Every structure is written in structure tokens, then in C-alpha cells.
Assembly symmetry: D3
Homo-oligomer: 243 residues x 6
């Protein structure tokens, strides 16, 4: 019996799952694996079974935004998933240090969403599993891929208006490294559901400089590949522990 | 250039736009019109130009969740859209009155999201445009399609937990009619950017009884058809004026 | 027995009720009707039965402020009232477009009070009934009286301080049309008590320019008379339907 | 130069001012003084200069509710008033100890309004001036009138609904003595404007027992007489000091 | 049986207790009394039974901070204490009037802590007992020591950052007189536990001018002695009553 | 000059610091090190330079409560500290798995304080540094000391009351491991000041079973000894990175 919105069965769910926001990215990633098996595609949720380094793990798209990815995350977590790693893009909150193309492996996030709050009080931290976190950094090292580490601001607001000030600058001063829209939700759902989570992101611009055109419609080819290698490598290594 | 994430151009945006959640729903709607022209399909945002009753209007999918649909709505509102109508599914909060298949035309909504709050203080109301509301009702009447009218709870939480209590029962007692995940965001964004909004929904179950099987993976055919006719009819009438 | 604070019996309550802020305004209004019957006068709550176009409906003063009018509204809603229309004065939040004398028929409001929050969560919208809004607009048409439509900011703070910044500016940018002190409370109570509500206001100045003398201790003669015609006309139309 | 809503000049404002909720109560009080001079009556605000023991001080009605009384209090504080004492009715939050007829002199209050919050952060205390509190108690002492002392809950909600629970039971457990609707607002405005405030109240019932009829529409005559004696005595003594 | 953290038995607790922040201060106080008896010293909590003017009362240190002092206060309140007077240092929020070495007796405080909020809603006031307040002022008058009276801001943040603005300026404008870190917590716990509280503080600088070196590592010698005399004098007077 | 409250100079602060709550604890710790140098003891803040396994690092007591420890943490972070590890006691929030004497190395915390909120928005996470977390775990491993890992609830309330429900059960359900009073504050301050933090705690009871006598007057001897060895070992390892 398929999951309400992912449209896959519990038996099709592997212990390690790699989630991305763009359903089209799932097709781009499956092709770089040793082999793959398409499972389903419903709404913005595309699921494919990946095979990498003799290891097996799913790759599912969660779509844009916290409320949307929460549906995906909850279905994965409540049906077998043990490790969920989000791989996506992000904006730099430190323009003088982190730039387009750079990779950042995050261990925690700012809960600027609503669903995590509807799940647990705001004082609760949005934090990833440090073993998952460690696995990601090690894979990066072994591949000789320099990366940044830090906190990501997960905000439900992509396009700000001019009435209520955005908190991005505050968080930049607070030393948050990047900003995206799903990590915190994944992390909180993960801890509440005893699922190990992690996150690796690649910068595609800086929201502080969008007016000056500091935004790339497309990610830096070379680096996107490196990040995916890191991500796949990690999932493989982590999967080995449940095989 | 094209809209950053919708991947359509400014000149391709019609004054009137029909938005739905499932990108697949867009293809099912375009084939009911007299003719159409596929525009783009990026992530969960599928855009198509619809031709119905001599009128021209777009149909765009916004995806699941307030943060994701916010990306879609902002691009549309900041690039020419004058009227946006959301057509989707919802759950009944008045099970003894509103049942599966029933249709509800909502005039306002509960802002249980975060993005709208990041845009304007919570005391501000999520309310639709009367003209659009009235147009939708006048079309249902002409088609002899009975509908309900009321407030929708737009909540970011689809799958509740056992720690923090859901506010759905409170809102039911407060006389809210249904519950879905995007209307309040559409409304507030519309108001802030001077875009007229409206919404028509079809009940697919009751959240108070999911644990009892009250959920249709498939919507009621005739009802869904009648809702789309109303939706399409409403868009045609409004488009005429702007034409 | 009599309503605790209105000092009128339940049987003296008509399905349609017109409420104003100033108890003295009730006298100024009872005169222009065909005839009337004074019911009571307790504190700032003055009740009178009005006879207009062969229709019976009460006119009750509610006083200044959300907490005060809430007492009035609850006693009415819980004892027979089916429709309540507030007619009063307001300040303009769009000075370049809305000026002294202008009439605005509002469909929703900003809940900047406390009592509505003590009744239901802040995410809940303060929105009036569509028929009442429609009825009021049409009556304005019939009488060839140009009127604005929009959202009203209902704030418990009339005289601002210099420590905590007023939110009026924010709301003006958010496109709120006018500002008064009781509409949101009326709307929420009505929605909760299944009572259709509506509001029509006359501009007596702009709070952004009070330091410039932009305030009329006396409302515009013809304009006020016109608004009153509209209100009475609307009450008449609605009372007929309930008979 | 009349005050916008009180309709009196800054010249008619005495340093000490006695405020009551009911404009009718002002008349019942002025005739118990040596002499009086009616000043004005607008909306629910009736002003009268009271003469007592050779002392001159005003008695003004402020209406029901924090938002409404705030207009009164600001106009008075911003135009001369140096001392403001509120004399009114209240409900008992300690049914086994405080009953109908009993008098309570309050030194502080719970800010369950909105206007005090729009003026200053919530953490700020609603507290009366010790001097006024002390004089009121001493006057009660001299007249041999027993009285309670304690905290009053100033809540904007008089008639509660059944969705959001009331905080009255919580405050009763916290040892709040009484409940009314204007004291917290007077205290905060007083502190902010450098005006000494105080409040004396007579119990008319218990909200926990309204369903039992524990509410007297009429205040115990003798008790009310004694309270006003205490109030007028205090106003005279304080008036002397400011002479 | 000994209290968990104060390490004294319930029988050793006197009806009146003088509390100070620094355990070192306890020792400096006991020697100024007629005679004393050391009870215990655990963590930062030092207890000593003081004998003064033929009266008996304890002097206990509560440490720096609301959370830390709450532990001390609860153990005292839940085990026999009837009166608790805090004597400590503070910063001036009115640099034009209250200078270093000046003494302020406070009647209420701003609740900028967390513990009091975990105990009761924020709207509840942090207010001291009148009798204790009055006793402190009378002892000051008898000793011919001029003192200020006013509200204290009890803030958990001593060293502010540059991201979130400090509320001290707002409170100075709201007329708060001084700032320290434990009074509000004492007051709220006292009210809840029916224990009479008070506070007397000596100014050690002004947080608005720390960058100008406006801070005394050592309190004004004579002033500190004067304050302690007032403090001990008050405890003696209040202790007599329970004796 | 000296730090205002720690009373040590900037030059006396080592890059790595070990903080504990009880000042008496640093004397019990310094004695197990190779040698030490007492620096100062002011209020509840005792500082001693420890020499262990060829490295030098300070051991400083911070007292009970977040507000108090923030003073200590801020003085250290703004004056040279690069690594701060907290070693203290805690309560078990999972009494069926974590019992008296068990050791828990925490990587994140619940911000149930106030000071962290006065420094940065609540959505920000309280999370420790991975290097520190990893070092602590590796040291426990080397010493064959089993330990738990998890989130700690840092709450300013030690003794709850019966009015406002404690959120501990909620956090237990959310899978928080233990509860104490200072970790979250240390974490947030460190993230903001660019200082690496960590925490290791020994369980001395369970808040859910205090009434049934589930409290440890004294920490389990051999377990406390082991945790101290782990903490001292971690500090030395981290210190070498700055030697
Ligand atoms: C508008 S859809 C953008 C997606 N890409 C990520 C993202 C990249 N750059 C930025 C940025 O600058 N701000 C906020 N989100 C993103 C977010 O997590 C969304 O899933
Ligand atoms: C999680 S996918 C559900 C979508 N369908 C709508 C919906 C239908 N029924 C319900 C319900 O019972 N609760 C919340 N949302 C919905 C929402 O707007 C989402 O876009
Ligand atoms: C406080 S007395 C003013 C009354 N008239 C209305 C009003 C008119 N103009 C304004 C304004 O500029 N600000 C706030 N309220 C009003 C409010 O609803 C009150 O009942
Ligand atoms: C509804 S008008 C009641 C007025 N009398 C006072 C009052 C008396 N008894 C109670 C009670 O039980 N609850 C709340 N307010 C009051 C309040 O301060 C209002 O000005
Ligand atoms: C941070 S240690 C300072 C202690 N002395 C008091 C204090 C003196 N001056 C000030 C000030 O300017 N701001 C905040 N607290 C204090 C507080 O109540 C603490 O217990
Ligand atoms: C109030 S003395 C308790 C100290 N020991 C720690 C502690 C041990 N057990 C518990 C508990 O069950 N709840 C809260 N704190 C603690 C806290 O961090 C304080 O510094």
C-alpha cells in the first residue's frame, strides 16, 4: 500500500534516503549512480532507487518550501527511513567569505518556518545528526573538495517585501553561514521521529545582492558534481551500516 | 529574461491566472479548454496558456505548501497578474455538513503559515476580493452547482504530532469551513501587491477522521468537473473585463 | 428579564441591528427614520427601535473601544441579533486618495485589539459577511454615492506614544484603507456567534497629519447624511429578508 | 481649546481627578459633595468639577473598556492631571473570601488589554502609586471601613466563549484578588505620563459563579456609599497637597 | 531535613529573610549585627542567622541571576519565610537624577527574565508588598538617609550584543528608575507563594555610560553602610511583628 | 585592568576553558590535575589555571542559572577564550534509559532561558561545536566510559508550580535526553562570539520522580570521577591545538 503522496510502498523505502528539492534533479543524479530504478512520480515528489558503490539508497524530491517537504519527510520518517540527507542549493549570508559555487555542510538551522513550530515549541533546536555530519565532511576530504561548515537559516520567505524587515542580516551577524528553505524542517522532524538527518548545500548567490544580479539561474557545473559525489559517497557509506 | 522560477516571460503572463497545486492537474485542465499553449515546466511549476470562451488566461501549478506557492504567487503578482484564483482540494472541518465531493468558495482564511507573517503582522487579515468571490458564486449558480461559502484554515501542518495540539478543532468550533495549505498566503500576497484573489475548493476528506478511512486519493469525478467548470467560467468572465 | 448591560429584553431584539459609537448619534438617526421607540439608555449603551420602509430594526450605541463594544455585541449576538452593521467614523490611511468626508464600506479588518484574541487565535481573520457588504455597496449605487472599499485597521490605541512605534504606517503600505477602533472586534464576534456583520465609515481626518490640524470635530454634513441613508437603506433591505 | 473628546479646556483640569466607568455615576457622586460645576458631556465622557471639604477636583466617566478609557486617561494626563483615582466595580476572584459588597483597594494589575501593550512592552508592570494606595487605605482606616487589598485582573474580555480558555482561574491561583476592565490601563498610562494612580473597587459578583446568579445588577447601597466616602476623602487630601 | 541547595533545615528559617547577591556580602553584613550564627555555605548560597536590635532574621546570598536566585527564593518561601527583602546593587536608568551611590527603594519591576514567565503569564505584575516598601522608607527617613523610589528593570542580560537592541532605553523613557537582575523574580515568586517582598538597591553606575568608565568596582563606602542600616533596620522592625 | 566580575586579566585567560556550576567543584577538580595556579574567587566565580597532560587551561565556576553564567561566559568569550566546555549535573528526561550516575555528552539544547533570546531571535539554534563534541566522545571511548548523546533542555525553572504547565514532558516526548540550566546559554553565546562549545553532564536524578525521592544528594563517586577525567582529557587535547 503506497504512501499517500509519495506513492511508494514501505518496502521500497531504504534506511538511507537522499532528498533534493527539484524533481528534475533526481533524474540528473540517478544517471550518475552505478544503476537505478524509477519508483514513482506524484506531484513534485519523484522517487528513484539509487545504486552507488555497491550500495542501495533512495533519492526523493521534496519540493520547494517547508510545508511541502514536511509531507515528504513525515512519510519517509514514519515508514522506515533511518537516515535522511538533504542536498540542495542555498544563498550566502557571508558574501566576503562564501561565494557562488561554494559548498557548505550544515549541522543546524534557524527555524524560520511554521510547521516545525506546529510540531514542537520554538526553543527546541533544529540540529542534525553529528555522525551524518561527520560522514559528509570526511567524504569531502577524501575527494579533496574544500567546504564550509555552519548554520543555515531556513526561511519560508524567498521574496521579501518592504514592510517587515527580513532577519537575514541579523542572522548573518549571528554567524549563520547560508540560507535555504527546508533544512530546519527536516532536522526537527528527524529528531522527533528518531531519524538521523544532515545537509549539504551549494551556493547559487547572495540574497543581499540580488538587486545587483548576484544570482545564477544555473549552478556551477564542476562544483555541483563534486557536491553530488560527496552526497552520494556519504549515503553509500551510511547505508553500509544498515545493510 | 524569464521569471526566475516559473521560467515564463513577463509578456506571457495574462492579467488573469488560475493556480492549482498539482502540476498534473494543469494538463488535465488545459485539455478541457478550447485550446492552449504549453509555456514552461520547472520544478513543480507547470505553466500553460488557456483559451476558453474566447478568453486567454494562464493556469499554473504552485505545489504543496505556503512557502513554495509563495514563490509562484510573488513572481505572478510582481509581473503583471491582476487576478489570481486558486482551485484545489481541502478537508472538511464541519463533517456533519460538508462532505467528500462538496465544493466551497472561500472568502477569507486562517493564516497558519509563516511566510505571510514574514510579510506583514499577524493581526492583518487573509481575505479575498469580493468581485472574484461573487464571480465564482455567480458562475456556480448559472451552472446550477450548489456550493458552500466560508473561511478556510490554511495550515502548514499536514501530518499532526502528539506533542503540540492541532488547532483544527478550535477553528471548527470557530466556524471555519474547510482546511487546506495555500489560500491564506495567496490572499495576503494579493492584498499587499494589489492583486485580486479568490479560491474554490473541493473536499477530499475530513482530517478528524483520516484514522477511519475518510480520505479520497481520487476526487469525485462529477464534482471535480463542475468545480473546474466554475473555475474556468470565473476566469473567463474576469478575463473579459481586462481584455 | 433584560440584557445585563443593554437593559433591553430579548424580545426587543430584532434580527437586524445598526450600531454606532456615540450614544448621541442614535438620536440624530432615530429622527430621520419614519418613526421610532426608545428602548433604554444604560451607561454609553443607548437602544432605540427604528421603523424604516415598513421595517423594524434596532439602533444601539456601543461606545468607544473594542472591550466596551464587545459587551454590547455579545449581548446582541447571544440574544437574537442575526445581522449587525456598524456605522461610524474613521481616519484615513491613504491620505492622497481618501480624504475628509469620504465614505468607506469595509469587508475585513486588522485585529489590533485584545478581546478578539481572547476569543480565538490571532491567525483567524476578522472578515465581514459578503451579503451585508454587497447590500451596502448596492444601496450606495442606487443613491449615486461614490464610496471606497477596503480593509480597516481596528486599533485599541488612539493616542500613540513615542516608545513603541505605531503600526499604522506598516498597514498603510500593506494597503489598509482606514482606521477606527471597533470593526475587527465586531467581525470576529459575529463569525464566532454566526451573526452576519458589515461596516461603513466616514473619514474625519488622517492620524498621519493630526499635527497639521487634519481632524474634523464635526463630520461632513451631506456626506454623513448620505452614509446614514445607505446604512438605513441596507438595514431595511436585510430586515425584509429576515421577516 | 477644548480637549478633543472630553470637550473641556486644559484650564478646567484639576491636579486630582476621580474617574468612574458609568457617566451616570458621575451625577450620583456630585450631589454628595458640597457643591459642583458641570463641565461637559460627550459620548460616554461626563465631566464635573467636585467641591469637597473646600477642595476642588474633577470627576469624569471613562466608559467600559481599556481602549475607551485610554482616550479619557491620555487627554487628562496630557493636559494637567497629576493624580487619577479610579473608583468602580469588579468581580471576585477569591469566592471563599471576597464577596459582593466588599471593597478592595488595588496596588497593581494584570495587563490583559492591548492598549498598554501598544504603549510599552509586556514585561512592564501595571502598578499604582504607593502614596495614593496609602492615602486610600488610611481614609478607609479613619472611617473604620474594612477593605481588602490586592491585585486586580484588568481583562478586555467580559463575556467569554468556550474555544480559548479564560486566564481567570490561573490568576485566581496566582492570588489575584479581583477582576475588572480598566485599572491596568490607567496604571501604565499613569506611570508613562508621570501621573500618580490608584483604584478602589466594589464587588458585584463572581465570574466563576455567573451561571449561579452570583451577580448583583445593583451595588450594595451602604457599601457603595462608604467606598465613595473613601474615594472622595482621598481625593480631597491629595487635592490639598497639590494646592 | 535540609533544604536541597541552601543546606539548612526548615526549622532554621526565620519569618524574615534578608537576601543579597554576593555570598561575600553576607559575611560583611553579619559582623555589622549584634551577633550572628553561620548556618551553611553551599555553592553560592551562604546562610547566616543575624541578631540585630534584639531581633532575629537570616541573611542569605542568592547569587547572580534570576534562575539562580529563584532556587534560593523558592526554598525559602516553601519553608517558612514570610518576608524577604532583597538588598543589592543596580545601575541607574535616569542618569540625570539618580547617580552612583544613590539608594532606591523599589515597589515594582519589569519582568525581563524567564523563570517568572514559566511560573505565571507575562501580563501578571511584578510588584512588592506595600508594608515592606513602607517600612524601608520609614527606616530611611528615621536614619535621615535620602532615597529614591521607583520601578526596577530586572533583566537577564548584563552584557548586551549589537544584534537585538536592548530595551533599557525604552524602559528609561517609560520612567523605570534603575536596573538589576533579580527583583522581579523575587516579587513574582513572593506573590505566588504569599510571601511579602521588598527591595532596596544602591547605584553602582549607569549601563548607558559603561563605555565612559561609569562603573564603581567598589560601592560608595558611606552610602553602602547607610543602605545596610536601612535594610537591617527594616528586617528588625518586620521581624518584631512575627515574634 | 581585570574582567569586571571574574576578576582575572585578559592575559590570564587560556584558549581553552572548563566551566562548572559549583565553585567548590573547581577546587575538587584542580587537585586531580598535575598542578594549578589559583587566580581569583569573586562572588560565585572561582578561577584556577589547571595544568594537565602537558597543557594549560582554566577551570571556572559559573554559578546556578543562565543569567548568572552569561556574565561569566561573556567575559571569557570577549577576552580570548576559544573553547569552552561545560561539565555539570543534570536530570534524566528518559528515566527508563538514562539513570542516576549516567553521563551524557550533549550536542545541542532547548533555549528555555531569557538571556539567549535577548541576544538573538528564538528560531536560532543552541548547538555545540562538532570538534568539541567529537573530542569529548573520543576521550570517553579511550577511557572505556559508556556515555549517552543527546539534546539537553536548558530551563530557568528548577522548582515548577501548579499554574503554568512545565514543558519537560513535551521535551521528553520530543526525545530530549536530559535537563539542566546553562548549556543552551553557553552554546548561543559561543556561536555569536565565535567560540567553540560543548557539554558533558552526569545525571543526579529525574524531575518526573522527584516526589518519590528520585534525587541524588551526592553524585555517584566513580561516575563523577570518570566524567571529570573525560572532560579534563578533552580540554588537554583541544588545548594542544592552540599551544
Ligand atoms: C525559490 S526556490 C529556491 C530553492 N533553492 C534553495 C535556495 C537557493 N538559494 C537560496 C537563497 O538565496 N535564499 C533562499 N533559498 C535559496 C531553497 O532551499 C529552495 O528550495
Ligand atoms: C499534502 S498534499 C495536500 C494538498 N491538498 C490540499 C488538502 C486537501 N485536503 C486537505 C486536508 O485535509 N488538510 C490539509 N490540506 C488538504 C492542500 O492545499 C495541499 O496542497
Ligand atoms: C477615540 S474617539 C474616536 C471614535 N471614532 C472612530 C475614529 C475616527 N477617526 C479615527 C482615527 O483617526 N483613529 C482612530 N479611531 C478613529 C473610532 O472608531 C472611535 O469610536
Ligand atoms: C461589562 S461592563 C462592567 C464594568 N464593571 C466592572 C466589572 C464588575 N464586575 C466585573 C466582573 O465580574 N468582570 C469584569 N469586569 C467587571 C468593569 O471594570 C466594567 O467597567
Ligand atoms: C553581572 S553581576 C551584577 C550584579 N549586580 C546588580 C547590578 C548592578 N549594577 C547593574 C547594572 O548596571 N545592570 C544590571 N545589573 C546590575 C545585579 O542585580 C547582579 O546581581
Ligand atoms: C538549582 S541547582 C541545580 C544545578 N545542577 C544542574 C541540574 C541537575 N539536575 C537537574 C534537574 O533535574 N533539573 C534542572 N537542573 C538540574 C543545573 O544545571 C544547575 O546548575
Amino acid at each position: 500500500n503506497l504512501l499517500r503522496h509519495l506513492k511508494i510502498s514501505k518496502e521500497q523505502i531504504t534506511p538511507v534516503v537522499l532528498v533534493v528539492g527539484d524533481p528534475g534533479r533526481v533524474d540528473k543524479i540517478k544517471v550518475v549512480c552505478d544503476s537505478y530504478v524509477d519508483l514513482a512520480y506524484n506531484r513534485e515528489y519523484k522517487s528513484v532507487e539509487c545504486h552507488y558503490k555497491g550500495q542501495k539508497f533512495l533519492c526523493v524530491s521534496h519540493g520547494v518550501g517547508s510545508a511541502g517537504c514536511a509531507v515528504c519527510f513525515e512519510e519517509l520518517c514514519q515508514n522506515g527511513a533511518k537516515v535522511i540527507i538533504r542536498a540542495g542549493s542555498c544563498g550566502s549570508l557571508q558574501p566576503d567569505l562564501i561565494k557562488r559555487g561554494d559548498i557548505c555542510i550544515c549541522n543546524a538551522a534557524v527555524r524560520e518556518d511554521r510547521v516545525s513550530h506546529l510540531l514542537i515549541h520554538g526553543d527546541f533546536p533544529a540540529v542534525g545528526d553529528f555522525d551524518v555530519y561527520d560522514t559528509l565532511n570526511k567524504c569531502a576530504q577524501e575527494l579533496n573538495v574544500p567546504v564550509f561548515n555552519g548554520i543555515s537559516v531556513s526561511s519560508d520567505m524567498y521574496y521579501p517585501n518592504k514592510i517587515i524587515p527580513s532577519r537575514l542580516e541579523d542572522y548573518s551577524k549571528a554567524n549563520a553561514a547560508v540560507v535555504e528553505m527546508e533544512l530546519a524542517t527536516l532536522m526537527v522532524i528527524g529528531t522527533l521521529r528518531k531519524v538521523k538527518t544532515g545537509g549539504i548545500l551549494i551556493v547559487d548567490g547572495c540574497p543581499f545582492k540580488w538587486d545587483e544580479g548576484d544570482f545564477d539561474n544555473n549552478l556551477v557545473p564542476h562544483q555541483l558534481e563534486n557536491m553530488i559525489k560527496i552526497a552520494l559517497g556519504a549515503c553509500a557509506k551510511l547505508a553500509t551500516k544498515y545493510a
